[PDB]
Structure 1
Amino acid sequence: IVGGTASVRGEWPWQVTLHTTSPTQRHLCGGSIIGNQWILTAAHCFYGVESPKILRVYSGILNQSEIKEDTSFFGVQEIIIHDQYKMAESGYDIALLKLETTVNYTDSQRPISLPSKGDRNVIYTDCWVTGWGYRKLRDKIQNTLQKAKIPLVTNEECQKRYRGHKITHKMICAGYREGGKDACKGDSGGPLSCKHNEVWHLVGITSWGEGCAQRERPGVYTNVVEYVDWILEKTQ
């Protein structure tokens, strides 16, 4: 996260850190708890992941340094990538992780709601991006989960900033015209979380952008409301 600040324990309890263990253990992507056995993340995360065997899902983590050899994690039973996914910039950047067992929800590990049926024309004005990613283009993965408030951009404006890409209704963009706050390397797969009527909704999945927090180059997120039917089909 560029231009963000440290979170405190329990502040984003749907946020998980997805680790790979091949050839060594490290943070790979963010993700969001959406059900007791379900994580929503980005399809692009699994480029070069040979199978679910090497994945570990950690919940309730504030600092990456908390994770040691006896820290409990969830195994991944299945990776479900959208059938039309080809590359992040061309959309369909969405994946479900089915966990091997059910998360018991606690103060540190909680689900986030999907965008609600009948909220298609809500204007979300309280949106946040969170993650352990770089604070700038050439940086490092952060120990403490970071947060930043970022405004949504219309798809019309976003397309004008990305005339070499097809910005579709299945994407949502977010960023300041002057730049300075954005996701960056290591944040992808995590949530764009928006609060409406004091309930948090998983509005976006951190996906791609040109650079990090550059002027007039918003971050691009998978528009989760356009995939609710797909999510419900796979999770039922």
Structure 2
Amino acid sequence: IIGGTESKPHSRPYMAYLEIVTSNGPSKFCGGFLIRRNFVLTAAHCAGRSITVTLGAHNITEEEDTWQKLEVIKQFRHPKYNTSTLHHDIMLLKLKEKASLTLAVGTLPFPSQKNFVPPGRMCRVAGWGRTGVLKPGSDTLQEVKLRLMDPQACSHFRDFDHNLQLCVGNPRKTKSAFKGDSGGPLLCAGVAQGIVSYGRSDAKPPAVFTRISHYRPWINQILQAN
């Protein structure tokens, strides 16, 4: 998160910190969010050979009783995920067990409505990602208020599409999701409308988020059938 504030500890109890293992390099990290006691939503580009989820975290460098370190048994990438265009950049993680509900750990549900969100309004995103181009990931959960933009603001991302994705962050400001924030939810008036997907290497906003609304039928399908 660039240009944000430190979150009040445990104030976003659905937030998930993902450590992703690959066979041939060191760990990578993403965000995500708990939508059922045994399911986490994140970005498909955060897939790996294996993933460990930490719920209940604020400062990820300091173990505490709120932590739940949970095994992932299976990763379910959206079947239309494309690694070139990054369309359908969304994935469900099934946890080996159900998480414990605590003050610091709970789910974020969807409203029954599956409405399309138009541009104009302010939304919030949180994550442990980098705080600048040459800066490590934050030890503490950070968050930032960003402007939903009209889709033309993201035209320079030549594979951006308005019906699949949200365009997030006023280009006049430095405030933005960034590397390490992948998979984190964008909340607009307290409702999850998108997922951090990608942006510019130089961190100039806007960034591109996966629009959850398109995927609700998919999300329902995996949840009902697993």
**Is the TM value for this pair above 0.5?**
yes
| Cα distance in 1, alignment partners of residues 84 and 215 from structure 2 | 15
* 1:20 alignment counterpart: 20
Identity of aligned residues (%): 31
**What do residues 82-113 of structure 1 show as CA deviations (whole Å, max 9, x unaligned)?**
11112274311000001111122221112112
Q: 1:202 aligns with which of 192, 210, 226?
A: 192
> By how many angstroms is 1:124 displaced?
7.5
Structure 2 CA distance for aligned equivalents of residues 116 and 177 of structure 1: 33
* Alpha-carbon distance change, 28 to 227 in structure 1, aligned in 2, over 3 angstroms: same
| Cα distance in 1 for residues equivalent to 2:119 and 2:184 | 21
Q: Which is worse superposed, 35-44 or 101-110?
A: 101-110
Higher helix content, 1 or 2: 1
Report Cα offsets for 1:165-186 as digits up to 9, x if no partner. 2424110111013131111111
- How much has 1:127 moved relative to structure 2? 1.0
- Name 1:73's counterpart in structure 2: 69
1:139-218 to 2 correspondences below 5 Å: 139-159=135-155, 161-162=156-157, 164-195=158-189, 200-214=190-204, 217-218=205-206
Judged with a 3 Å threshold, the aligned counterparts in structure 2 of structure 1 residues 120 and 86 are, in CA distance, closer, same or farther, namely closer
Distance 2:10 2:159 in 1: 37
> Are residues 1:98 and 2:94 paired?
yes
Normalising by structure 2, report the TM-score.
Answer: 0.88
Shift in Å, 1:125: 3.0
Q: Which sections of structure 2, spanning at least 5 residues, go unmatched?
A: none
Deviation at 1:139, TM superposition (A): 1.2
Match of 2:44 in 1: 43
Q: Which of residues 218, 221, 233 is equivalent to 2:209?
A: 221
The Cα shift of 1:21 comes to 5.0
Deviations 1:52-101 (A, max 9, x none): 3xx21110100111248xx6411111100011112274311000001111
Pairwise CA distance, 1:27: 5.6
> Does the C-alpha gap of structure 1 residues 145 and 25 become closer, same or farther in structure 2, counting only changes over 3 Å?
farther
Q: How many residues align?
A: 221
Query: In the aligned structure 1, how far is the partner of 2:193 from the partner of 2:117?
Result: 12
Structure 1 unpaired stretches of 5+: none
What root-mean-square deviation, in Å, do the aligned CA atoms of Structure 1 and Structure 2 show? 2.3
Q: Secondary structure at the match of 1:157?
A: helix
Aligned counterparts of 2:146 and 2:73: Cα–Cα separation in 1? 34
Structure 1 length-normalised TM: 0.85
Q: Deviations over 1:150-175 (max 9, x none)?
A: 0111223323x43x224241101110
Q: Partners in 1 of 2:84 and 2:193 — Cα distance?
A: 17
* 1:98-139 Cα deviation digits (max 9, x unpaired): 111112222111211225415335778341111111111121
Contact 2:120/2:149, CA 8 A, preserved across alignment: no
CA 1:226/1:9 → structure 2, altered by over 3 Å: closer, same or farther? same
Q: In 2, distance between residues paired with 1:220 and 1:35? A: 25
